[PDB]
Every structure is written in structure tokens, then in C-alpha cells.
Design an enzyme around this catalytic site. Structure first.
Site, PDB file in Angstrom:
ATOM      1  N   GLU A  12       0.644  -1.321  -0.067  1.00  0.00           N
ATOM      2  CA  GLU A  12       0.087   0.041   0.016  1.00  0.00           C
ATOM      3  C   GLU A  12       0.856   1.326   0.123  1.00  0.00           C
ATOM      4  O   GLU A  12       0.781   2.148  -0.875  1.00  0.00           O
ATOM      5  CB  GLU A  12      -0.959   0.214   1.213  1.00  0.00           C
ATOM      6  CG  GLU A  12      -2.175  -0.748   1.228  1.00  0.00           C
ATOM      7  CD  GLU A  12      -3.040  -0.390  -0.221  1.00  0.00           C
ATOM      8  OE1 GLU A  12      -3.055   0.726  -0.356  1.00  0.00           O
ATOM      9  OE2 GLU A  12      -4.122  -1.320  -0.603  1.00  0.00           O
ATOM     10  N   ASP A  18     -11.858  10.387  -7.699  1.00  0.00           N
ATOM     11  CA  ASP A  18     -13.100  10.806  -7.152  1.00  0.00           C
ATOM     12  C   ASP A  18     -12.865  11.885  -6.001  1.00  0.00           C
ATOM     13  O   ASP A  18     -14.020  12.325  -5.242  1.00  0.00           O
ATOM     14  CB  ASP A  18     -13.591   9.593  -6.172  1.00  0.00           C
ATOM     15  CG  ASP A  18     -12.979   9.125  -5.094  1.00  0.00           C
ATOM     16  OD1 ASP A  18     -12.066   9.647  -4.935  1.00  0.00           O
ATOM     17  OD2 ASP A  18     -13.303   7.962  -4.700  1.00  0.00           O
ATOM     18  N   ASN A  70      -8.711   5.844   3.366  1.00  0.00           N
ATOM     19  CA  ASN A  70      -9.231   6.817   2.326  1.00  0.00           C
ATOM     20  C   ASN A  70     -10.174   7.741   3.008  1.00  0.00           C
ATOM     21  O   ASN A  70     -11.073   7.276   4.049  1.00  0.00           O
ATOM     22  CB  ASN A  70      -9.858   5.863   1.160  1.00  0.00           C
ATOM     23  CG  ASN A  70     -10.605   6.782   0.121  1.00  0.00           C
ATOM     24  OD1 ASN A  70     -11.858   7.097   0.454  1.00  0.00           O
ATOM     25  ND2 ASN A  70      -9.581   7.217  -0.662  1.00  0.00           N
ATOM     26  N   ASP A 106      -5.868   8.764  -0.336  1.00  0.00           N
ATOM     27  CA  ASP A 106      -5.464   7.802   0.693  1.00  0.00           C
ATOM     28  C   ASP A 106      -4.247   8.164   1.579  1.00  0.00           C
ATOM     29  O   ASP A 106      -3.284   9.078   0.987  1.00  0.00           O
ATOM     30  CB  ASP A 106      -4.989   6.494  -0.202  1.00  0.00           C
ATOM     31  CG  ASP A 106      -6.134   5.878  -0.996  1.00  0.00           C
ATOM     32  OD1 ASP A 106      -7.420   6.123  -0.597  1.00  0.00           O
ATOM     33  OD2 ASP A 106      -5.616   5.756  -2.233  1.00  0.00           O
ATOM     34  N   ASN A 150      -6.952  10.396  -5.421  1.00  0.00           N
ATOM     35  CA  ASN A 150      -7.973   9.672  -6.081  1.00  0.00           C
ATOM     36  C   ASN A 150      -8.897  10.454  -6.978  1.00  0.00           C
ATOM     37  O   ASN A 150      -9.201  11.623  -6.844  1.00  0.00           O
ATOM     38  CB  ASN A 150      -8.951   8.787  -5.331  1.00  0.00           C
ATOM     39  CG  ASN A 150      -8.118   7.676  -4.359  1.00  0.00           C
ATOM     40  OD1 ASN A 150      -8.296   7.569  -3.410  1.00  0.00           O
ATOM     41  ND2 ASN A 150      -7.322   6.901  -5.177  1.00  0.00           N
ATOM     42  N   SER A 163     -11.178  11.854  -3.418  1.00  0.00           N
ATOM     43  CA  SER A 163     -10.762  11.393  -2.054  1.00  0.00           C
ATOM     44  C   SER A 163      -9.020  11.277  -2.203  1.00  0.00           C
ATOM     45  O   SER A 163      -8.492  11.269  -3.179  1.00  0.00           O
ATOM     46  CB  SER A 163     -11.208  10.000  -1.649  1.00  0.00           C
ATOM     47  OG  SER A 163     -11.017   9.084  -2.577  1.00  0.00           O
TER      48      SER A 163
END
Ligand code: NA
EC number: 3.2.1.17
Length: 129
Positions: free
Chosen positions: A35, A48, A59, A52, A46, A50
Site C-alpha cells: 500500500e 473521486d 481513504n 489515501d 484519487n 478522495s
């Protein structure tokens, strides 16, 4: 901070993740490896809107408040910046809320792709725990 493999393994152990929701310690170490590459400061925006955050790439659309993800939730009840600390405590406490049943590590894509059904014990082999 970038953790070493065995260093992180020991920290995760300290934090009570071994056998949490039935998941052996190597699962958590492997998740972090793929990750964030063990980097506590890792962030990824991201498509969208968002982001991480941190060693487990948690998220903002569901788990933390970054003040910049409209219409999102904050299930861990923390600012996302808490997840970028050098100590992994906030990230582990939120991860324990994410993994609410025995199939809960499926929340991490890198875990499903690189860890699930592999020799995850490899990730703690050679360490002192
Ligand atoms: Na949020």
C-alpha cells in the site's frame, strides 16, 4: 518515516494486530508494504476527489476528515493528518475499525492482489518478534 520490514512487524505486534479478526501478523505487514512501501507520509489523490493517507493508505471518502472531500464520512472520527504520524497508533486504531469481520482485509486492494493467499509469513520471517 520509512519503517524497515522487521521494525514495522515489531510495532504492529506491540499494537495487538497478530490474530486480530483471525489475521496473522504477516497480513498486516504485507498490506503496508504494498500500500505505502512502509512510508508513514504516503498520500495518493484519487479520481473521486478522495485521498489515501499513511502507511495503510486509508481513504478520506469514508474513514477520516481532510476538509476537502465533499459529501464524505469520517468513520474513524479523526482528521486524516493524524494518519501521517511517525508512530502507527492512529492508523492501527482506524484499521481495527475497518476490519470488522474475518473477511475485512479485503478493504485493501494491494492486500487482495499481493498478499491474500500467498505465503504472508514471509513478511515476518527473519525478524525477532
Ligand atoms: Na471524510
Amino acid at each position: 518515516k520509512v519503517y524497515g520490514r522487521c521494525e514495522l512487524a515489531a510495532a504492529m505486534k506491540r499494537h495487538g494486530l497478530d490474530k486480530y479478526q483471525g489475521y496473522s501478523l504477516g497480513n498486516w505487514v504485507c498490506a503496508a508494504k504494498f500500500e505505502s512501501n512502509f512510508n508513514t507520509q504516503a498520500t495518493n489523490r484519487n479520481t473521486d476527489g478522495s485521498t489515501d493517507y499513511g502507511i495503510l493508505q486509508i481513504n478520506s471518502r469514508w474513514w477520516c476528515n481532510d476538509g476537502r472531500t465533499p459529501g464524505s464520512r469520517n468513520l474513524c472520527n479523526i482528521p486524516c493528518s493524524a494518519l501521517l504520524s511517525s508512530d502507527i497508533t492512529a492508523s492501527v486504531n482506524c484499521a481495527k475499525k475497518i476490519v470488522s469481520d474475518v473477511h475485512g482485509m479485503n478493504a485493501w486492494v494491494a492486500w487482495r492482489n499481493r498478499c491474500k493467499g500467498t505465503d504472508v509469513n514471509a513478511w515476518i520471517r527473519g525478524c525477532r518478534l
